[PDB]
Amino acid sequence: DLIGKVKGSHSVVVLGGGPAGLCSAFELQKAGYKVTVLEARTRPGGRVWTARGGSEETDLSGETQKCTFSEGHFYNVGATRIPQSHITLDYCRELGVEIQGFGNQNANTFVNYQSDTSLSGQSVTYRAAKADTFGYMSELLKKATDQGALDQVLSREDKDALSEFLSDFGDLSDDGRYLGSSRRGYDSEPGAGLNFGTEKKPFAMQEVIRSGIGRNFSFDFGYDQAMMMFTPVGGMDRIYYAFQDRIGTDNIVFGAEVTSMKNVSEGVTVEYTAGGSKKSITADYAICTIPPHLVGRLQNNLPGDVLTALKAAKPSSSGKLGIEYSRRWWETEDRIYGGASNTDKDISQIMFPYDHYNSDRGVVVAYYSSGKRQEAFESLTHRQRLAKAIAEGSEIHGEKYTRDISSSFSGSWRRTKYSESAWANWAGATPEYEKLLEPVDKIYFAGDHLSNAIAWQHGALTSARDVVTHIHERVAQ
Amino acid sequence: DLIGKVKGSHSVVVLGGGPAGLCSAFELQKAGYKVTVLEARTRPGGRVWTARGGSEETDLSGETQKCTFSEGHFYNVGATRIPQSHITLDYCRELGVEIQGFGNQNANTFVNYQSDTSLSGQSVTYRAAKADTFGYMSELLKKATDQGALDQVLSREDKDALSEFLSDFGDLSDDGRYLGSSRRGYDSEPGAGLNFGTEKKPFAMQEVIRSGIGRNFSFDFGYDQAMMMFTPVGGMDRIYYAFQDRIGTDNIVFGAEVTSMKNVSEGVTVEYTAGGSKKSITADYAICTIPPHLVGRLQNNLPGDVLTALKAAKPSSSGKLGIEYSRRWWETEDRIYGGASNTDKDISQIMFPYDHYNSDRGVVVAYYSSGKRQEAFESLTHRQRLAKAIAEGSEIHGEKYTRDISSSFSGSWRRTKYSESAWANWAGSATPEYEKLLEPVDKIYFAGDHLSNAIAWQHGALTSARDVVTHIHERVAQ
Numbered sequence: 015d016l017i018g019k020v021k022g023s024h025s026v027v028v029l030g031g032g033p034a035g036l037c038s039a040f041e042l043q044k045a046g047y048k049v050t051v052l053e054a055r056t057r058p059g060g061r062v063w064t065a066r067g068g069s070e071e072t073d074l075s076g077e078t079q080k081c082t083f084s085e086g087h088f089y090n091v092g093a094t095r096i097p098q099s100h101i102t103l104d105y106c107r108e109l110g111v112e113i114q115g116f117g118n119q120n121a122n123t124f125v126n127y128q129s130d131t132s133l134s135g136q137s138v139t140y141r142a143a144k145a146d147t148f149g150y151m152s153e154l155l156k157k158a159t160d161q162g163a164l165d166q167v168l169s170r171e172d173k174d175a176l177s178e179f180l181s182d183f184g185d186l187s188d189d190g191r192y193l194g195s196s197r198r199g200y201d202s203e204p205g206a207g208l209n210f211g212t213e214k215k216p217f218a219m220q221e222v223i224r225s226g227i228g229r230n231f232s233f234d235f236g237y238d239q240a241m242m243m244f245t246p247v248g249g250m251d252r253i254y255y256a257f258q259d260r261i262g263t264d265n266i267v268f269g270a271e272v273t274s275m276k277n278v279s280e281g282v283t284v285e286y287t288a289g290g291s292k293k294s295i296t297a298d299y300a301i302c303t304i305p306p307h308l309v310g311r312l313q314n315n316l317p318g319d320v321l322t323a324l325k326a327a328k329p330s331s332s333g334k335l336g337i338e339y340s341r342r343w344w345e346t347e348d349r350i351y352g353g354a355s356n357t358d359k360d361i362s363q364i365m366f367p368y369d370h371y372n373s374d375r376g377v378v379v380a381y382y383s384s385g386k387r388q389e390a391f392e393s394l395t396h397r398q399r400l401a402k403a404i405a406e407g408s409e410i411h412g413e414k415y416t417r418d419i420s421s422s423f424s425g426s427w428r429r430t431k432y433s434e435s436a437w438a439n440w441a442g443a444t445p446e447y448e449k450l451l452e453p454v455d456k457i458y459f460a461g462d463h464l465s466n467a468i469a470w471q472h473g474a475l476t477s478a479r480d481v482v483t484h485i486h487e488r489v490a491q
Numbered sequence: 492d493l494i495g496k497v498k499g500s501h502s503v504v505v506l507g508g509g510p511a512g513l514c515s516a517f518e519l520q521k522a523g524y525k526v527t528v529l530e531a532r533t534r535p536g537g538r539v540w541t542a543r544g545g546s547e548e549t550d551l552s553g554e555t556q557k558c559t560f561s562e563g564h565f566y567n568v569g570a571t572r573i574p575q576s577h578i579t580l581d582y583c584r585e586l587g588v589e590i591q592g593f594g595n596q597n598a599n600t601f602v603n604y605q606s607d608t609s610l611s612g613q614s615v616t617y618r619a620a621k622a623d624t625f626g627y628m629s630e631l632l633k634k635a636t637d638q639g640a641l642d643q644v645l646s647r648e649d650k651d652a653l654s655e656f657l658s659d660f661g662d663l664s665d666d667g668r669y670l671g672s673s674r675r676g677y678d679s680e681p682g683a684g685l686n687f688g689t690e691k692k693p694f695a696m697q698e699v700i701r702s703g704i705g706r707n708f709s710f711d712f713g714y715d716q717a718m719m720m721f722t723p724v725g726g727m728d729r730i731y732y733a734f735q736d737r738i739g740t741d742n743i744v745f746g747a748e749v750t751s752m753k754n755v756s757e758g759v760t761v762e763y764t765a766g767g768s769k770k771s772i773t774a775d776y777a778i779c780t781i782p783p784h785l786v787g788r789l790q791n792n793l794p795g796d797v798l799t800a801l802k803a804a805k806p807s808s809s810g811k812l813g814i815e816y817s818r819r820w821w822e823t824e825d826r827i828y829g830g831a832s833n834t835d836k837d838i839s840q841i842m843f844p845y846d847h848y849n850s851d852r853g854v855v856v857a858y859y860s861s862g863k864r865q866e867a868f869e870s871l872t873h874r875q876r877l878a879k880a881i882a883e884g885s886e887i888h889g890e891k892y893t894r895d896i897s898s899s900f901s902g903s904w905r906r907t908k909y910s911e912s913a914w915a916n917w918a919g920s921a922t923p924e925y926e927k928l929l930e931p932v933d934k935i936y937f938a939g940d941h942l943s944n945a946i947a948w949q950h951g952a953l954t955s956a957r958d959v960v961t962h963i964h965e966r967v968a969q
């Protein structure tokens with residue numbers, strides 16, 4: 015239990031029904047607080063958004079998209095993957111939300127980068143790229159070791175142990191050279207009888223190094239990205255529908271756009287518009303989870319230094335586009351089940367689905383790009399985004415990328431109402447971040463931007479839990 | 492797709508209802524053949540065997556085990572994981588057998604090895620072991636590069652490109668040293684506000700190198716092992732129950748122990764015992780999928796050189812033991828969801844389940860060992876196997892490994908009736924004996940994973956079946 019039971023009658027108004035707001039309300043309700051959540055959208059979850067057939071969104075350019083994905087097919091437009099250490103998994107257990115493996119590493123997906131080599135724009139499987147990179151890296155270090163270059167820092171026994179590892183790790187020949195490997199895979203698959211298959215032949219060391227084909231390998235080691243990774247069965251938003259049901263829709267107002275938030279003698283008063291009608295609520299405390307760049311637009315009585323601090327959390331660009339195909343060509347032709355291809359192209363990566371394996375259709379995330387490479391899609395119409403996504407994807411996965419397309423749906427977070435950002439990038443543990451951890455009398459800020467896991471649900475959930483703890487301690491005093 | 496409709500009446504008898512025999516029967520039927528499968532066990536799938544509540548097995552030592560796993564809980568005693576290139580996945584599609592990801596790599600599982608270092612017998616997470624190993628490896632290669640040791644094989648531009656890669660790959664400091672990394676993980680998890688968490692500190696370079704904590708990293712790169720890997724929901728045996736259902740139980744005799752296989756004028760006659768009674772069946776062709784070391788025990792009229800060739804496929808030892816725990820401590824305490832811990836101990840590895848994530852109970856594969864390290868379990872009683880498994884596992888995962896144990900079940904393939912081997916190793920390893928056994932012996936064809944280039948994979952058995960069925964069809968077509 016996060017906190018004990020509160021004594022007496024105490025109320026909180028929560029602004030925003032994304033992860034931070036819903037977690038706050040859930041934990042406060044458990045402890046016996048009166049809670050009301052005000053959410054501007056007509057769905058729970060905020061930047062956790064899962065697109066399915068029937069999903070409709072009008073972006074800030076006024077373009078309306080209507081998703082027509084087949085029944086049971088979806089993709090996560092925002093949050094999609096969860097590492098094992100995140101409290102998000104603890105909440106899935108608490109809420110009864112089934113999880114499954116998320117394919118965050120795949121030997122059979124492709125890398126494709128421009129370079130001043132003949133590999134420029136050429137797709138290479140991760141296993142082939144890794145075998146060559148680690149093969150030559152191991153050969154080079156073994157050579158330097160054998161040459162005596164490391165004799166001042168490695169003993170004879172150290173050298174022997176290192177050499178043994180390098181021969182194994184690089185699949186080196188008996189004489190210490192990288193000559194290729196079954197780890198690269200096969201042009202023709204080994205089968206029965208005399209069908210030995212045909213190993214894919216290695217690139218040259220100069221090709222490997224000068225192509226930068228290993229530039230994405232360290233992604234596999236990210237603390238928040240290393241396998242095993244997880245995701246809820248049927249979409250990430252299921253966590254937030256589960257929170258909603260535990261909180262009770264009687265305690266959440268959807269379609270409630272907050273327009274004012276003020277400390278008053280009675281507590282905190284929040285004005286909002288819902289169903290075109292003007293409403294007001296007063297509670298003893300407020301938890302404001304509205305993205306920080308949007309808070310200043312509210313009528314408010316926050317001190318100037320707080321308003322300035324909020325402006326330091328700079329918006330960031332990110333977006334995705336999903337294409338439903340009526341043939342799972344990635345599985346049938348490329349032998350790709352989940353995972354992502356990686357590229358320097360604007361699309362940045364192509365992410366293959368982790369569900370409906372071996373079915374008749376599926377949604378591919380044709381891009382998930384951020385920063386400069388999302389700016390390249392943000393101002394395009396959806397039709398233009400799709401055309402660009404298909405063109406770039408076909409340069410990686412071939413002409414099959416252009417065929418069997420049923421429908422598509424995109425989001426760009428900076429252009430999305432009530433988000434206008436994928437996640438915060440603080441100017442310069444900064445003074446402004448630290449300032450915003452303090453209450454403004456009875457108003458508390460919470461959200462992933464006020465954590466050390468920005469752009470992770472874990473950040474939002476831990477922020478919520480800290481703020482709830484602070485309110486509870488204050489009430490106790 | 493494999494073959495397109497045979498003309499007239501043609502029959503095949505298939506000896507063995509494991510993957511090769513069932514695949515053979517399935518494809519022959521699709522092409523219009525009369526087929527009968529003779530299987531000694533009461534279940535389809537052979538070395539694909541899934542232990543669940545109600546499974547009873549009497550091994551060749553006379554010990555009977557009765558599995559009492561909770562409903563829905565199981566483990567694969569034989570085949571358990573499938574890489575993306577294997578035709579096994581295409582059969583799952585054809586048969587409507589749902590698959591899920593198999594966790595074959597996990598940053599949070601442990602390595603634990605003996606060495607002449609302070610890491611001897613100490614559990615280290617894969618991510619910490621990898622960060623330290625690749626950190627110091629990268630530091631050392633960058634040092635050698637900067638020193639000029641590779642100036643004869645790398646240009647100035649190559650050196651700069653390599654240096655850039657190594658700094659990133661090893662998470663090196665700006666001046667080229669490995670000083671630790673968030674990649675190692677945290678003793679306290681980063682949270683909100685000023686709760687930054689605390690990174691796990693690195694081991695020293697010599698300790699890391701001499702500990703051999705990286706000795707299993709290359710497993711991640713195995714062609715048949717690299718992620719992404721898959722497995723059927725509810726057990727690998729679902730593939731073979733699906734084959735059984737498509738073939739029809741009317742075309743499969745279970746509890747049929749073949750005792751004789753002979754070429755005869757009209758084809759092949761196979762004698763077998765079923766329901767205590769001596770039976771005989773004759774068909775135009777036979778496909779024999781009985782493991783090769785067991786074929787010589789049959790009455791037969793195979794030529795001497797064929798009998799000799801069969802003996803070159805040497806049997807091997809492998810086994811597993813599963814423990815149902817009433818608390819998923821690996822998830823709740825160690826933040827391990829699937830994957831395997833790896834060790835030099837006899838248990839060899841501890842494999843955590845890939846289903847029922849976040850639930851109240853689960854089966855852990857407390858060992859999966861082969862060769863010498865399975866010989867250490869083969870002659871032990873199940874109770875002794877369990878005691879050894881728990882002792883060794885507790886040395887890796889702590890006292891929690893000994894708690895909340897509900898039940899257990901083990902198999903050792905050399906001691907298992909109708910298998911007596913996990914898989915074949917051909918003496919001299921194609922070897923001449925392997926090549927010889929690809930040829931028909933008049934109307935008898937051999938098939939199985941041992942007659943493939945994917946021995947110990949269902950893919951090997953399935954491609955063998957397909958090749959043999961194709962040969963029979965081409966011959967029938969003339």
Ligand SMILES: Cc1cc2nc3c(=O)[nH]c(=O)nc-3n(C[C@H](O)[C@H](O)[C@H](O)COP(=O)(O)OP(=O)(O)OC[C@H]3O[C@@H](n4cnc5c(N)ncnc54)[C@H](O)[C@@H]3O)c2cc1C
Pocket residue numbers: 029030031032033034035052053054055058059060061062091092093094095096102270271272273303304305308332333427432433435436437460461462463468469470471472473474
């Ligand atoms: C592209 C992308 C990729 C991501 N990848 C991952 C991932 O793989 N794994 C992971 O764990 N997380 C991921 N995330 C991060 C995750 O989505 C966030 O950490 C989480 O949603 C933050 O929760 P929050 O409550 O702080 O903010 P939000 O989710 O932004 O919620 C704020 C809420 O406030 C509401 N609101 C705004 N204005 C008003 C108003 N005027 N009145 C009332 N309500 C208002 C919004 O509608 C919204 O529901 C990703 C997010 C994005 C966008």
Ligand SMILES: Cc1cc2nc3c(=O)[nH]c(=O)nc-3n(C[C@H](O)[C@H](O)[C@H](O)COP(=O)(O)OP(=O)(O)OC[C@H]3O[C@@H](n4cnc5c(N)ncnc54)[C@H](O)[C@@H]3O)c2cc1C
Pocket residue numbers: 506507508509510511512529530531532535536537538539568569570571572573579747748749750780781782785809810904909910912913914938939940941946947948949950951952
């Ligand atoms: C420990 C272990 C781990 C494995 N790991 C993997 C893995 O992860 N992935 C994977 O794809 N594969 C794996 N396999 C390999 C897979 O199980 C085999 O490739 C496959 O079962 C071989 O099929 P088969 O038909 O050639 O032989 P078998 O499966 O051995 O079938 C032979 C059949 O013959 C029957 N038989 C024997 N004698 C008689 C008789 N006298 N009369 C009638 N019938 C008889 C047997 O009962 C059996 O059903 C593993 C196997 C083991 C044992």
